[PDB]
């Protein structure tokens with residue numbers, strides 16, 4: 001009884017439907033690797049070294065997961081680099097399939113397999129029990145449509161159904177806006193929250209089960225990859241501590257033309273509606289609050305770049321150590337420190353809202369990353385010396401995304417042409433198939 | 442015109458006099474070197490490595506300066522390690538001498554010279570223009586009694602005489618609760634604020650004038666010492682941004698037994714009268730707000746320790762490089778990085794209020810400290826390698842203050858013995874002379 005076809009709800013709920021549709025205006029797709037080429041080096045050997053953009057409107061989730069280089073150019077339903085779990089946070093079709101096929105059945109297999117199944121935009125059935133008769137009557141009926149997210153909330157001692165209204169509001173965002181990994185043979189989404197949500201809890205969690213996301217191809221370090229941990233870091237910041245929910249800033253209550261209050265579904269930058277967001281709680285003016293936020297943004301940016309630069313040198317120094325014949329046992333304590341430094345850095349800055357949601361926590365994490373990078377490069381200098389190398393390791397030119405991608409052995413020309421071909425030809429086929437099966441309108 | 446004998450004011454201003462006197466209740470003198478022996482290593486060759494306690498009541502300023510190991514046991518008025526400037530932030534006799542002898546005449550000579558002249562407790566004339574007829578009438582007539590504090594406020598574009606009431610409130614505290622250095626042959630107190638009050642502004646300021654406070658005796662680094670930068674960090678934090686003044690929290694308006702409002706002069710922990718401090722602006726209860734502050738205290742302490750462990754290794758590694766024949770030119774780039782690393786650290790945590798006044802800026806500075814610490818230690822491992830050393834440098838046992846002070850070659854037993862003799866012998870002579878001269882009731 002999951003209804004992925006969002007337009008079904010438009011006549012009944014035009015205020016929400018129309019503002020939900022309006023994230024298509026948040027259309028700028030900003031190239032983060034271009035802005036920061038050092039990312040290409042840290043993520044060397046991982047699909048993030050190919051294509052990483054800043055988040056844009058919910059309306060683009062499906063297009064973005066289709067179009068990113070990270071998903072590649074699969075040639076059949078069992079091909080392509082990535083698994084079914086990549087659709088999970090993109091489309092209400094995920095809730096449809098989890099319902100139709102069960103959770104294990106949904107996760108089974110490759111991302112390509114879901115192409116003709118997962119076609120509706122991130123929407124109503126992701127956050128709402130749209131089956132409930134109270135929903136047509138205009139009550140939200142908030143629900144967790146994703147059982148892995150429900151299990152995670154229970155893991156942190158906050159089961160959804162026993163939570164109050166205000167906790168639930170943030171929990172629906174917390175279905176997607178979290179750090180996750182792929183667990184088990186089927187690569188199911190799991191939130192690493194069993195020992196809590198602090199960078200130190202997750203770090204020890206991942207070490208205890210010996211998990212790695214990929215091996216950095218320069219340093220050979222078994223690495224952990226952080227993703228957008230908004231729920232975890234918001235929980236850590238002063239706003240979250242005061243139960244200022246994601247919704248208080250992100251989905252303000254606004255009035256339609258006839259003066260009726262509804263929830264603004266145009267999920268974006270809270271500053272775009274300051275009067276209905278921050279102004280509900282703060283007497284300071286818009287420019288004053290923007291300036292403070294911009295300053296924490298810059299403070300974080302400056303320290304993040306320092307840590308990234310240490311991390312670039314460390315990877316290249318570990319590369320030189322390997323090139324000078326370092327063995328696995330020689331490298332292991334170095335790679336442990338790289339893994340930890342980089343885990344701490346990535347969780348600190350993988351949420352683009354960290355300077356707003358929990359700037360102290362972001363800054364703290366970057367300091368603890370820095371501590372491990374120092375340990376890595378110090379160990380590395382001693383290892384290099386034992387191989388008879390006592391000079392500074394030179395780094396190749398990485399002044400642009402293109403040079404850094406080339407520096408790590410990526411043929412971007414081919415990766416892009418194959419991708420371009422996949423987008424022009426396969427997508428239109430997936431949409432046609434979806435329509436013929438009445439999955440798409 | 443300065444009246445340094447505070448009790449002169451007890452009849453006219455009893456509510457303020459009696460609460461001012463009550464800082465004598467705040468009497469615990471907590472040994473900060475015992476709590477953190479790494480400080481002895483960082484400060485090796487400087488008096489802070491001998492004796493450093495946490496702040497206590499204003500009532501003890503004079504006592505503490507007399508009794509600390511840092512001022513030693515001068516045998517006469519031309520003796521002892523420190524200058525007149527050490528009196529400057531302890532007593533209203535400072536304001537008396539500056540008026541009497543001029544600011545140059547006050548600064549000339551040794552701390553010992555001022556013993557029999559600087560005898561009254563930190564008090565009314567330090568913050569108030571008590572010579573004004575308006576003062577007898579109960580008006581505050583706040584003033585800057587310290588000309589070097591007045592130049593600093595003008596240097597940051599905030600001349601006191603033009604500042605509104607509420608800016609002036611924190612400026613009185615900013616006569617003392619700042620980072621400073623000793624300038625010129627006479628060792629005059631100066632706030633290094635010409636280029637701004639940010640750690641980066643001050644670092645570049647001290648480098649441009651080629652200033653150091655001392656040479657670390659292990660690494661031979663020309664160091665910068667930070668002191669309690671409350672004014673600077675308060676300005677950088679969210680309260681200062683909102684002109685929540687030092688007074689809003691530390692000197693709240695309270696009622697006497699007859700219901701007359703007055704400024705509470707018992708300057709201490711704002712949480713002791715939570716109902717008239719935080720509760721004036723916040724709805725959260727005391728335990729919740731104490732919990733947040735304690736959490737930031739812990740965050741910063743955790744990171745602070747990591748930085749200090751890296752610095753401890755850096756100084757001993759530098760020691761090892763020197764002992765292996767490193768030249769001045771070889772040491773120079775490493776000492777720059779230790780000097781900068783340690784400056785950023787010390788400025789981050791030399792104010793014991795940092796986790797309250799500006800925890801994000803504290804955490805930010807510690808991360809920039811760690812960036813340089815990583816440079817210093819990577820450099821050192823390479824340089825040590827050129828001397829044929831490729832093993833990690835072992836550190837002596839510094840698990841207690843006493844062990845750390847032994848390791849840096851302090852004869853604590855003789856230092857303490859000489860100091861205790863001085864306290865019991867010279868202080869009463871000073872008091873007797875002051876009384877005889879009408880300076881001390």
Ligand code: HEC
Nearest residue numbers: 009013016017020122123124126127138139140169262263
């Ligand atoms: C697809 C276009 C839809 C439609 C038809 C609706 N929504 Fe949402 N919604 C979400 C949240 C967090 C709230 C507020 C919850 C609360 O106040 O406790 C709402 C609110 C609603 C309502 C209730 C009426 C109102 O405006 O308050 C209705 C009828 C409604 N919405 C319809 C969360 C989400 C999403 C999270 C990412 C998604 C996507 C949607 N909603 C999508 C839709």
Ligand code: HEC
Nearest residue numbers: 238242244248249270271277278280281282289292679723
């Ligand atoms: C809209 C995007 C904003 C912005 C820019 C800010 N807020 Fe809030 N805020 C709220 C509460 C309860 C606090 C704790 C202080 C208190 O007890 O009053 C804050 C704190 C802040 C800060 C300072 C904290 C920091 O991160 O350093 C800043 C810069 C800030 N806020 C900006 C409460 C609310 C709301 C209540 C429902 C809402 C809405 C907002 N804030 C929105 C915003």
Ligand code: HEC
Nearest residue numbers: 493494495496505506509511527529530617618621630669
């Ligand atoms: C000349 C080098 C000295 C010496 C020997 C001392 N002072 Fe100060 N002092 C100032 C402030 C604001 C405090 C409280 C805040 C804090 O310590 O973080 C102190 C405290 C002390 C103490 C007690 C604590 C300790 O270190 O054990 C002692 C013994 C002490 N001082 C000695 C302010 C200032 C200044 C304001 C510009 C100046 C100058 C000095 N102090 C100088 C010295």
Ligand code: HEC
Nearest residue numbers: 026055056057060061064089090126172173176246250268
């Ligand atoms: C999975 C079904 C999601 C849920 C539930 C929520 N969000 Fe989301 N969000 C998701 C994705 C995959 C993206 C990126 C989309 C793209 O193609 O780039 C986003 C994006 C945002 C943004 C950025 C918007 C922009 O930059 O223009 C914001 C501020 C945001 N999301 C907030 C947000 C809130 C508050 C949520 C709970 C009401 C929420 N999201 C839920 C995936 C999912």
Ligand code: HEC
Nearest residue numbers: 052053054055064065068070086088089176177180189228
């Ligand atoms: C939730 C549990 C997710 C899983 C599993 C995956 N993604 Fe996602 N994605 C999620 C959110 C909340 C956001 C927006 C916030 C942000 O910081 O990015 C995104 C965004 C994307 C994007 C657009 C931004 C970009 O990186 O270019 C893409 C292309 C993307 N996601 C792809 C993608 C892939 C390939 C996944 C499987 C590894 C995947 N996502 C999983 C939430 C979640």
Ligand code: HEC
Nearest residue numbers: 055170173177230231234239244245246249270352353356
């Ligand atoms: C105000 C108290 C907020 C709360 C609570 C939440 N968010 Fe937020 N977020 C807020 C602002 C003002 C900004 C913009 C920062 C800026 O420099 O303008 C953001 C940013 C995000 C982002 C990054 C989006 C992007 O860069 O594309 C995301 C994904 C986001 N916010 C999501 C989010 C979630 C899921 C929240 C609850 C866990 C949440 N925010 C709370 C303001 C506030």
Ligand code: HEC
Nearest residue numbers: 447450454457458461563564565568579580581688703704
């Ligand atoms: C700085 C550490 C101070 C010292 C030492 C003393 N006073 Fe004070 N006083 C100070 C401030 C910052 C204020 C508040 C000014 C404002 O704008 O509100 C005051 C206030 C007074 C007043 C005014 C009446 C009142 O608000 O209580 C008086 C008469 C006064 N103070 C007297 C006084 C006496 C007698 C002192 C020594 C025993 C003394 N003050 C010390 C700052 C400081």
Ligand code: HEC
Nearest residue numbers: 467496497498501502505530531567613614617687691709
């Ligand atoms: C020099 C004349 C000062 C002025 C003016 C102010 N403060 Fe101060 N303070 C000063 C010293 C030398 C000390 C340490 C005293 C000691 O012997 O340890 C302090 C201490 C404080 C404290 C700590 C109190 C305690 O720990 O019990 C606080 C909270 C404090 N000072 C705050 C403060 C405020 C708000 C001021 C302006 C009203 C102020 N101080 C002025 C030196 C001087």
Ligand code: HEC
Nearest residue numbers: 496611614618671672675680685686687690711793794797
């Ligand atoms: C509340 C918004 C404050 C303002 C503004 C200022 N101070 Fe403060 N300070 C505050 C608290 C609650 C505390 C104690 C923190 C804790 O862990 O309980 C402090 C601490 C200090 C200290 C350290 C005192 C000590 O450890 O002995 C000092 C010296 C101090 N505060 C001084 C000070 C100055 C000079 C300020 C204006 C520049 C200032 N504070 C503002 C609360 C608040």
Ligand code: HEC
Nearest residue numbers: 238282679683685689690711712718719721722730733734
């Ligand atoms: C007004 C004269 C205040 C007094 C007294 C105290 N606080 Fe405050 N606080 C005030 C403002 C205007 C703000 C900015 C947020 C806002 O409401 O606009 C704050 C902020 C805080 C915070 C959050 C920021 C942070 O430091 O992480 C905390 C934790 C806080 N305040 C605590 C606190 C305590 C413990 C106080 C007494 C010692 C206190 N505040 C006094 C205004 C004022």
Ligand SMILES: [Ca+2]
Nearest residue numbers: 180225226227
């Ligand atoms: Ca992850």
Ligand SMILES: [Ca+2]
Nearest residue numbers: 621666667668
């Ligand atoms: Ca100094």
Ligand SMILES: [Eu+2]
Nearest residue numbers: 054055056057
């Ligand atoms: Eu965006």
Ligand SMILES: [Eu+2]
Nearest residue numbers: 495496497498
């Ligand atoms: Eu104290």
Ligand SMILES: [Eu+2]
Nearest residue numbers: 281282722723
């Ligand atoms: Eu408030």
Ligand SMILES: [Eu+2]
Nearest residue numbers: 238360679801
């Ligand atoms: Eu804050």
